[PDB]
From a paper:
The highest level of expression was obtained from the fusion with a two-Ala linker. The 3rd intracellular loop (ICL3) of β2AR is another flexible region and it is subject to proteolysis. This loop was truncated in the fusion protein by removing residues 235 to 263. Purified T4L-β2AR-Δ-ICL3 bound to the inverse agonist carazolol crystallized as small rods in lipid cubic phase (37% PEG300 (v/v), 0.1M Bis-Tris propane, pH 6.5, 0.1 M ammonium phosphate). Crystals diffracted to a resolution of 3.3 Å; however, due to radiation damage, our dataset was limited to 4.0. Nevertheless, the dataset allowed us to solve the structure by molecular replacement. The interaction between the β2AR and T4L is sufficiently rigid to detect electron density for the 2 Ala link between these two proteins. In the T4L-β2AR-Δ-ICL3 crystal lattice, the packing interactions are primarily mediated by T4L and there are no contacts between adjacent receptors, indicating the important role of the T4L in facilitating GPCR crystallization. Each T4L has four packing interactions: 1- against ECL1 and ECL2 of its fused β2AR-Δ-ICL3, 2- against T4L of one adjacent T4L-β2AR-Δ-ICL3, 3- against T4L, ECL2 and ECL3 of a second T4L-β2AR-Δ-ICL3, and 4- against ICL3 and Helix 8 of a third T4L-β2AR-Δ-ICL3. T4L-β2AR-Δ-ICL3 exhibits ligand binding affinities for the antagonist [3H]-Dihydroalprenolol and the agonist isopreterenol that are comparable to those of the wild type receptor. Only minor differences can be observed in these two structures, presumably due to different crystal packing patterns. However, in the T4L-β2AR-Δ-ICL3 structure ICL2 is not involved in packing interactions, yet is an extended loop that is nearly identical to that observed in the other inactive state β2AR structures.
Numbering used by the authors:
A (entry chain B): 1002 to 1163
B (entry chain A): 29 to 314
Write the structure that this text describes.
């Protein structure tokens, strides 16, 4: 399912680390905070967790946080007036692809593509893919972009599992 | 492809069952029957133990890794697993080498075809084999001496869902030479001399049983097989040390798995011996 998708694309790390932006991140794609300070990240983390983690957390915990982030993700996608119509017209699969794009690029970032969303809502896949392939997101991470896009056109998990 | 993953699941399940079944058979036959108890079959017992640990501990998790296209067992068990793997292979080659040497010193002693070592010496030798094997496998792996310094390998190490073996050129070369090549050359030379001797005898006057020469042919078969299975793999290691990525990962994995499949060939090779055959058919209620 979707959890598997994200679990693959982003990846899962047991110990605190800095992401591609240099910000503090742990578990699957969970942002502790944006700051060079490890102490601020520790505060954020402990606030998200039950007790002091020192920066090390259990797989289970990581999954808990991932769930919180997915919840918050879905809520965000629903509240956004631009994204809402598109997400409602997409089947569970493409919905998952979308939730992926929102995990990586965030609400605003995803709302960045007007025509992509427009056609996704119009059930026109190929053209949409052609639009997403010329994007910045695709250029930055051509692998995840290619997989997600392929997921949009195919509407299947065949891109993440053979 | 779920259809593909199931097919592979069935194939590799048949593989694992074959390995476990066979080596278990060998060990049981060797341990139960007093007629089958000799230094040679003690070494064979060590070998079948190595291949057994290969069957239960390693192959299944590798299969799971390839099928699921990812590692679900966590870094800890990834590392320990690799340790188990290298340990097994090393112990195996060392065992075969020891066997070769034993046969050499046994054929050529004034009393011929007789091996000078009693039982408690053999056990000691095996124990030492496993000790130095785990010494050249676990230590380097548990001390993280193999680990590469590039960002890819580091990401794969810190990643719990990623199990991949990345080795700095140094570890690749050193470990592949010490754990494989040297004892290989040793075995080859020694056993070649053993065949030369066997031929210098068989043409000589009576009497020395042919069954023993057939046995030398059998052992020769075990060794030949092992070397032929693992050779392509250990060659490619040095290949990637010289020029890396000159060979596809898939191919690497393939040769790797050839080496794996080798672990189940021994039980079928021991059938050459009338003794092991009678024993086998005995345990099977035939
Ligand atoms: C798929 C992995 C985890 N298993 C690798 C090979 O089966 C055997 O590995 C070895 C056994 C003995 C000595 C060795 N030296 C090496 C150097 C590089 C890679 C593997 C080995 C190796």
């Amino acid at each position: 399912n979707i959890f598997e998708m994200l679990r693959i694309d982003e990846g899962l790390r047991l110990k605190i680390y800095k992401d591609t932006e240099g910000y503090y991140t742990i578990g699957i794609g969970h942002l502790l905070t944006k700051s060079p300070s490890l102490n601020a990240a520790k505060s954020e983390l402990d606030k998200a967790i039950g007790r002091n983690t020192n920066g090390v957390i259990t797989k289970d915990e990581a999954e808990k946080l991932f769930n919180q982030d997915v919840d918050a993700a879905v809520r965000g996608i629903l509240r956004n007036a631009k994204l809402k119509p598109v997400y409602d017209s997409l089947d569970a699969v493409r919905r998952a692809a979308l939730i992926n794009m929102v995990f990586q690029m965030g609400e605003t970032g995803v709302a960045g593509f007007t025509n992509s969303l427009r056609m996704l809502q119009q059930k026109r896949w190929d053209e949409a893919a052609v639009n997403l392939a010329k994007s910045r997101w695709y250029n930055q991470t051509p692998n995840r972009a290619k997989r997600v896009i392929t997921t949009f056109r195919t509407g299947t998990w065949d891109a993440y599992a053979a | 492809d779920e259809v593909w993953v199931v097919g592979m699941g069935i194939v590799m399940s048949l593989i694992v069952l074959a390995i476990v079944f066979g080596n278990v058979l060998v060990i049981t036959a060797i341990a139960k029957f007093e007629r089958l108890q000799t230094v040679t079959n003690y070494f064979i017992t060590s070998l079948a133990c190595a291949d057994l640990v290969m069957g239960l501990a390693v192959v299944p998790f590798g299969a799971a890794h390839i099928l699921t296209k990812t590692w679900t067992f966590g870094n800890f068990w990834c590392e320990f697993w690799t340790s188990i793997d290298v340990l097994c292979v090393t112990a195996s080659i060392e065992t075969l080498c020891v066997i070769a040497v034993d046969r050499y010193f046994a054929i050529t002693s004034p009393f011929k075809y007789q091996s000078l070592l009693t039982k408690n010496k053999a056990r000691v030798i095996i124990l030492m084999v496993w000790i130095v094997s785990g010494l050249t496998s676990f230590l380097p792996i548990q001390m993280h001496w193999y680990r590469a310094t590039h960002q890819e390998a580091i990401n794969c190490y810190a990643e719990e869902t990623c199990c991949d073996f990345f080795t700095n050129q140094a570890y690749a070369i050193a470990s592949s030479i010490v754990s494989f090549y040297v004892p290989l050359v040793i075995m080859v030379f020694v056993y070649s001399r053993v065949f030369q001797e066997a031929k210098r005898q068989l043409q000589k006057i009576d009497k020395f049983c042919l069954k023993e020469h057939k046995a030398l042919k059998t052992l020769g078969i075990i060794m030949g097989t092992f070397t032929l299975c693992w050779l392509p793999f250990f060659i490619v290691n040095i290949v990637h040390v010289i020029q890396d990525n000159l060979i596809r990962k898939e191919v690497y994995i393939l040769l790797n798995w050839i080496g794996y499949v080798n672990s189940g060939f021994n039980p079928l090779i021991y059938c050459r011996s009338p003794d092991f055959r009678i024993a086998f058919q005995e345990l099977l209620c035939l």
